[PDB]
């Protein structure tokens, strides 16, 4: 990777020190719940159209590990089987974290109203969605969930891997430990969103963590995001920045060539 | 038939040693019967009241708009006691009411209540105080027009 880690860790210390000295002007509550944003600037649009299914990047230091985070899980029909699974065969931390399980049919019934969608948006922090029904969620949730990319439904796999299926007769679900592993992986993973833009912002951590953790997290999300979700790899990549919600942007990488290829050079 | 099936299921639950509340859910239906609807209005439970326009004798419902106005209930006069009976599986219903609905229909009920408020009650707010009738016949109206025209000419 062209990026250097000593710069990244120095930038995390500088940005964190700025966050405390700005909050000093509860103090601890103001310092905490402050996300850290990695900004990618590219030379062209990263993807041709808006993709409303976010991509997952696995992190050594998982996000959303606080116990006050509520998780809403959306499954295929019926919701009764997955509710019983959460209530019976799930670990206690995941049982406390998951505050609502609602299937697609009940979502389309009870949350067609925009005010109902805003209430469901405000009542949770992380939304997980089964991949069998994640294509129907843009219409069922509207622009309330997809105008902002913060709380988009994260794709999880609950389908058992190989007519109309009867929900009451069969659920066609993978085993419960596999479901638990998928849910914890999706909760801990960072999220990337593809839009026809030169800028992508990804939440990598919080101010209350340590700059070594932020440096390791930003290094792995940079390498994975470039190798998977950036077309034409590094010569598409223009800039990398680190920023807070109200802080300035600290560069950690500039490029030397501002062109995708030499064919853009016309004499 | 639905009640018979529900009773058979509840009897099965009782035989297996479970309460009827474990197998049966809380129902949501329209409310009908004049005494029942008047009691719900007085207890301020009814969200919306629909009164048939053709109840004979009219004394059974002549106080109902005033009662709904005093209680602050949205009411609307609708055509067809037979049309309400088709709702309540009867030949004729004088008045129907909704107290509460399901969560997926709360928005629809609120939109209907607002549509009633600005589309019926605001339009009949003035016309409900006026005396009806007084229409003269065809021949009498023609005679009156001829007399007025003759008086204007002479």
């Amino acid at each position: 990777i062209p990026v250097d880690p000593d710069q990244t860790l120095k930038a995390c210390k500088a940005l964190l020190a700025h966050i405390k000295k700005a909050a000093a002007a509860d103090e601890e509550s103001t310092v905490a719940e402050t996300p850290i944003w990695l900004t990618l600037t590219t030379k062209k649009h990263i993807h041709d159209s808006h993709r409303l299914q976010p991509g997952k990047i696995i992190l050594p230091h998982p996000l959303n590990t606080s116990e006050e985070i509520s998780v809403c899980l959306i499954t295929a029909d019926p919701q009764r089987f997955y509710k019983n699974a959460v209530a019976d065969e799930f670990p206690e931390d995941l049982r406390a974290k998951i505050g609502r399980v609602i299937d697609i049919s009940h979502l389309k019934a009870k949350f067609k109203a925009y005010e109902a969608q805003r209430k469901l948006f405000s009542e949770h922090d992380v939304f997980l969605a089964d991949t069998r029904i994640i294509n129907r969620l843009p219409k069922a949730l509207g622009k309330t969930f997809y105008k902002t990319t913060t709380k988009r439904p994260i794709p999880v796999v609950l389908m058992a891997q190989r007519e109309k299926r009867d929900p009451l007769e069969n659920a066609n679900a993978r085993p419960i430990p596999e479901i638990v592993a998928e849910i914890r992986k999706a909760i801990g993973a960072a999220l990337v969103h593809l839009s026809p833009s030169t800028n992508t912002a990804i939440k990598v951590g919080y101010a209350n963590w340590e700059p070594e953790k932020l440096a390791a997290n930003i290094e792995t999300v940079i390498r994975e995001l470039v190798e998977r979700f950036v077309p034409q790899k590094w010569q598409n990549v223009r800039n990398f920045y680190v920023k807070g919600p109200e802080t300035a942007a600290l560069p950690i990488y500039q490029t030397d060539e501002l062109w995708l290829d030499e064919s853009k050079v016309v004499p | 038939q639905e009640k018979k099936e529900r009773l058979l299921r509840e009897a099965t639950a009782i035989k297996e040693g479970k309460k009827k509340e474990d197998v049966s859910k809380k129902p949501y239906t329209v409310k009908y019967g004049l005494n029942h609807v008047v009691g719900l209005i007085e207890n301020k439970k009814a969200s919306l009241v629909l009164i048939a326009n053709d109840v004979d004798p009219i004394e059974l419902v002549v106080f109902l708009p005033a009662l709904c106005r005093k209680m602050g209930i949205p009411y609307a006069i609708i055509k067809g006691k037979a049309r309400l009976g088709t709702l309540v599986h009867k030949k004729t219903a004088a008045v129907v009411a909704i107290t509460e609905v399901r969560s997926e229909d709360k928005n629809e009920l609120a939109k209907l209540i607002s549509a009633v408020k600005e589309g019926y009650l605001e339009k009949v707010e003035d016309t409900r105080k006026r005396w009806g009738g007084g229409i003269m016949g065809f021949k009498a109206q023609k005679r009156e027009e001829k007399r007025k025209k003759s008086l204007e000419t002479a």
Binding site: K119 | S47, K70, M71, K106, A110, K111
Partner: peptide, 23 residues
């Protein structure tokens, strides 16, 4: 709460009238 719930539960200021105490 919801605006729909407020509109459904909206009443007048005059208190309820009851025939009797119920269970």
């Amino acid at each position: 709460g919801l605006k729909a719930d407020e509109i459904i539960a909206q009443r007048s200021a005059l208190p309820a009238v009851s025939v009797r105490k119920r269970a």
